[PDB]
Amino acid sequence: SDGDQCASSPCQNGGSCKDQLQSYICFCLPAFEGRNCETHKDDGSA
Numbered sequence: 001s002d003g004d005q006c007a008s009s010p011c012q013n014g015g016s017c018k019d020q021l022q023s024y025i026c027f028c029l030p031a032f033e034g035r036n037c038e039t040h041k042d043d044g045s046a
């Protein structure tokens with residue numbers, strides 16, 4: 001699977017995705033979580 005696996009915005013919350021070997025990589029901030037930075041670590045009611 002050597003190619004690009006992030007040509008469809010897999011990560012969110014301003015996640016920095018980068019094309020790497022096999023799969024890709026998303027560099028986010030410590031205040032963000034989720035399988036693809038799609039969740040903000042705000043910790044409110046839920």
Ligand SMILES: *[C@@H]1O[C@@H](C)[C@@H](O)[C@@H](O)[C@@H]1O
Pocket residue numbers: 014015016017027028029
């Ligand atoms: C990509 O890296 C992450 C960690 C943030 O700094 C983004 O704003 C940047 O584009």
